[PDB]
Paper text:
The inhibition of BtGH97a using classical α-glycosidase inhibitors yielded Ki values of 59 μM for deoxynojirimycin 1, 59 μM for castanospermine 2, and 108 nM for acarbose 3. The structures of BtGH97a in complex with 1 and 2 were determined at 1.7 and 2.0 Å resolution, respectively. Clear 2Fobs − Fcalc electron density in the active site (of both molecules of the asymmetric unit) allowed facile building of the complexes. Both 1 and 2 are found in a slightly flattened (toward 4E) 4C1 chair conformation. Each of the inhibitors and the surrounding active-site residues superpose perfectly, so only the interactions for BtGH97a in complex with 1 are described. Hydrogen bonds are formed between the hydroxyl group at C6 and Glu439, between the hydroxyl at C4 and Glu391 and Trp331, and between the hydroxyl at C3 and Lys467. The hydroxyl group at the C2 position interacts with the calcium ion and with His507. The ring nitrogen atom of 1 interacts with a water molecule, which is also within hydrogen bonding distance of Glu439 and Glu508, and hence may mimic the catalytic water molecule in an inverting mechanism (described below in light of 1H NMR experiments). The calcium ion assumes an octahedral coordination, with six ligands, as was observed in the native structure. It coordinates the same four glutamate residues (Glu194, Glu508, Glu526, and Glu532), but instead of interacting with an ethylene glycol molecule, it now coordinates the hydroxyl group at C2 of 1 and a water molecule (all at a distance of between 2.3 and 2.5 Å).
Numbering used by the authors:
A (entry chain B), B (entry chain A): 22 to 68, 87 to 726
Write the structure that this text describes.
Amino acid sequence: QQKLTSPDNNLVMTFQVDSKGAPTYELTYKNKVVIKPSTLGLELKKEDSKTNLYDGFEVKDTQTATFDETWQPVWGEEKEIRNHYNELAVTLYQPMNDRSIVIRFRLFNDGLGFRYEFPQQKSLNYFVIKEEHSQFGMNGDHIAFWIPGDYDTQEYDYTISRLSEIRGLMKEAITPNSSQTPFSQTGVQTALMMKTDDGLYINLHEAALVDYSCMHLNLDDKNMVFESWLTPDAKGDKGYMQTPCNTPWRTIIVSDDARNILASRITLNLNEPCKIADAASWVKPVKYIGVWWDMITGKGSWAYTDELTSVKLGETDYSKTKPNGKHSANTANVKRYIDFAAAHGFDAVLVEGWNEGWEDWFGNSKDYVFDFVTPYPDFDVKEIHRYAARKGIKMMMHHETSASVRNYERHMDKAYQFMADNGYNSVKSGYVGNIIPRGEHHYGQWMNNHYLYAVKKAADYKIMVNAHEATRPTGICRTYPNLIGNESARGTEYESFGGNKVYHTTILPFTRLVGGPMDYTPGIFETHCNKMNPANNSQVRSTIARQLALYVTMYSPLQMAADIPENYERFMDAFQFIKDVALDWDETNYLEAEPGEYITIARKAKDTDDWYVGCTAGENGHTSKLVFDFLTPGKQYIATVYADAKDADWKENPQAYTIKKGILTNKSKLNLHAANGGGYAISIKEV
Amino acid sequence: QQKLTSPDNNLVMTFQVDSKGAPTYELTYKNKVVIKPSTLGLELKKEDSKTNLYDGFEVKDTQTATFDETWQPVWGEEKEIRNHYNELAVTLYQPMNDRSIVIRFRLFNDGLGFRYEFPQQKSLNYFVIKEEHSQFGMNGDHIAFWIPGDYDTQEYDYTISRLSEIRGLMKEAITPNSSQTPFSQTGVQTALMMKTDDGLYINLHEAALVDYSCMHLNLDDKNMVFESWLTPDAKGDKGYMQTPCNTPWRTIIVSDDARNILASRITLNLNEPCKIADAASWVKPVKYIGVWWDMITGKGSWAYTDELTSVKLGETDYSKTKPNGKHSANTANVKRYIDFAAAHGFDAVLVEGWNEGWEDWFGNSKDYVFDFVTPYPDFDVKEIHRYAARKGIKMMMHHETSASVRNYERHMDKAYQFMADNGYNSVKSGYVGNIIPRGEHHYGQWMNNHYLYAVKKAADYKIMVNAHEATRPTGICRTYPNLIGNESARGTEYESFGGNKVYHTTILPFTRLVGGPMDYTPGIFETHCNKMNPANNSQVRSTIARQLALYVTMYSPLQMAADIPENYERFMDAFQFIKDVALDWDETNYLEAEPGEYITIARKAKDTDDWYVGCTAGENGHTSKLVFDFLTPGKQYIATVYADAKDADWKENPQAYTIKKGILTNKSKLNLHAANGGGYAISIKEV
Ligand SMILES: OC[C@H]1NC[C@H](O)[C@@H](O)[C@@H]1O
Ligand SMILES: OC[C@H]1NC[C@H](O)[C@@H](O)[C@@H]1O
Ligand SMILES: [Ca+2]
Ligand SMILES: [Ca+2]
């Protein structure tokens, strides 16, 4: 039996093979069982004994090591991250197939990562995975914060329930989406967050998802065991491998303090170091607005014309079509956004609907759907470039692919060259619809390769990428820091489609944000969508002060202010917080955190002595007793508090807020109350 | 009921809608039934009554027209082709679905073409084909010359049998291949050739296979009706369509003279005119030798080293590996081939195994299998280029993809740029293995798009393409004349893998060649492969003189002399015919033709007064009584006859030949005998 312990001696992992040679591990934290005895292994597709990569193993060799080094991300929640673990690598020989694998375990003070490694050898070269069988056996019927396991979307509201209740709730939890493939009545996605009856918080996830299919979890709800369930390709297979190769890491992050789940950097720590040598010279955080919410609410259109039943690029002559009078991506309107962005200190303006093809973009399984380079007649690329550059603004490129992936790859070098030629150095991509090639899913090994290919190629052009609908992140930004965002979860757009649950932003930082930032597009001040489009009666489940808080509580180096300029102009005093808030941080302090209920975070803006605080709360609101002892002794600060007014409420009174300005020091304390679906934001600037 | 008749009144096509509103057609030739009443229509994938595009139609309108214009191919069997037909277009309206299609019929003196057309309209825009239901009802249990219906290979020997015998022969007709998907016990490929008891020859095929899935034929052997059977995608669907759009043409070529099947230009006539405006300036025929037969026989290797269990491009350092002593694509060897090519008036030298990756090329479903640009340590790209240039020789590029198609697309512009930068202006591509993306077949709509994308992109680079394993041709060379070849049928390589049937080359011109030329790689003089590789006991099923004949009887603007130079050196007198024979023709006269038995053809070399003749024969040999009245009155010609010796035989005495030189005029006659698996060749040069 092998035993591995954390540097602080609080976690212990024990490993051994059972009497049939099945690799088995368990994990305790402060003498409490976190992972009951659980097996590890894979089943291979038949080309018989060779399909078995799950038992019949003997421990052939073991190697231990300790690692303790600090490194600096290009952008992040703090300036420096420490990577400190004890490691055990176990070489497992399978006599019946004359082949070996290695399982490598890295144990941190805040949890465990493991992966399988497949050395090059005479009897293991090319192989296909039928299923991975990594188990995570739970010690109780925990509370879980989960979304349905699905090969194609993550755009679901979270459910909070016991593990035993998942099966009963799955049908209701799967809401409609134009591309979705659930796989089990007890399947959930990663990162999965849980709260135990004996006071632990446990997060199950993976890190460094490269050259492999995305992992979901399937629950055996009799034994309370989660098991890896990979995403199949068009033929049902779960990964083409060639040695030497490795699986991604699988992680169990655990603490008796929920704040320490947010603090963990295990996911980043398990990714390969930055491979973009000059990254710091060109990768930069971006605060932006955009021509966007018009189309999301239905006020405006992405399409230039309504008169055609379909379009064929390079045949359809848009100069001969009638403008529909709703096309928001027109030069004059874009210039007005550039004006507002420059006036208020934003870095960029996104424009969607700029290019030919939007008439057919949705649900047609169309191959040649966009060319990514040809503008509509009312979008003057060169004039918009020149005007933005003169005003100090960068335009952000939009590459919706409509999930037509061969089409995007064929156009990608020309599309990136077009960006370089026209002053665009960041692009928001998207993959709406069922994947083409047809039969593949959004999160299979094939598409994972695509998303990273797009990122690696972008890096060669010094382009930053934010990909909507892509596989959810697993820390690869460490390796490729030009991946500055994904959506890859249910974002603010769904506040226009019926709403997100009130507690949504009190869960995302414990789940989605583990592995990388989200382009959540916060900042809606007019929360009634019917003021944009009288036919849309959706209401954003937030107060205005909570929207402000999200600039601190939804971490990202890429931050949109998503409302339209005229709405911000109606509340310019509150808007000041969005203008002031930083995007990049030297320190972060998690002040309060309870998943599904509240999150309060203070961050120190990079290369400054200034701090920003946000709190976001769920259905029951939250009372904070803040203590400002993280400020510098002897310094005075000008603090501006943006808070819910008394009786603010996301539903009945969302726009009621107060703003109070005064002096804070490290001796200050403030009592603040977040409303139902409310929150607060504080700027704290050194005098 | 509508009647359409050929210009010469010999053929009549009758069309009507039947009682249930199914469009049906029939065809007669000289008062003999060719096609019995047969239905037309398609079934669509469900998004109920909208799935029906096969009945419930009524005739809304008809238009007739006559077309009679001549055009000139860039390269071909003659200088000018006449396109002369009577047309009927029927507009068919479907009340229950409020939509219309058009079926267009073109009737020539030698057969019928039809296609379906789908106009843009309110109720037919995007749709997916479940099956096409084009019927061809036969009037009898004909003799057919067929290969098994298959979505992935055409590399089968032909079978000659009655239609009623196909079922019982299918199992034995399907021989092993690395990628094959047969679909029916009575499924066959097109072009399908038949001979009827009442003296007709009937060929069933398609033309202009663009943006659509390849058609095979499935035989109802109780009623003798063939029906279109399209190639499914990874999900089983049979084509994504968007109006306005058309199916390919379906063709019935018929005559009571088998020579007239060979003379038909229906397939080319039904393709769109040339879209490469400057094609005449850079597209040109190519006679070549190659570093190739070494590897096909096993004498030499494509791989550089035998040391590695697999390779990772960009990681494996070949300069640190041991040469295997068998790698034929080495500079010195390549220079000896260039020497031979230049000494004997060849245009080009193909080299295979020049680039990194060949250690892994076969059967591994490997994604990143080649980069198409990085040479092995022993292949000096620049020196070979300089040396070839000094000798007036062009190198022919090789792009085997190992069926990894995303990989080839991602590299394609870099690969074509590397060709341009290094003086390569033609490329032989290949698709050996099951297709990646996995789940697709070689002949589905998805891959058909790929092969044409490769050709269209090549045209932008002024590059000519010869693609092995691609979908078999349907006349698209007319539209893109830089498609100078495919294999896409069983070629000479199989003569090294056990042999082709003796009658193979007496069938190919009636089947495979209809739609475009084949890179058959004739010219094997040493027909016992065991002299290349003693472990290889394969024997080419040919005499030497029949190999000479193939330069005339297997038409192609791309002609290999496939043997190694040292073998040609042994038989240099016979090699003279290969040296002399032209590649491109002002006229072709089909002298004798019976499928499966013999084919004799005379052609006039373009821009000359010289003629070349070849005869290829089956198992029984063939006696020819040639009459040279196609020569010019009053001219004398120097004729050289390369013929089988009287005791020649493909098996027992293949290298026995005679060469006779003398004078011919248009009054001359020659009696010649082709041996079993033999033939003869004649050069006829004006004094
Ligand atoms: O690309 C169109 C639309 N697709 C979905 C993306 O999430 C949204 O932000 C974008 O506006
Ligand atoms: O590309 C390797 C090999 N594949 C099959 C092709 O038909 C053959 O000509 C070529 O030599
Ligand atoms: Ca989305
Ligand atoms: Ca081949």
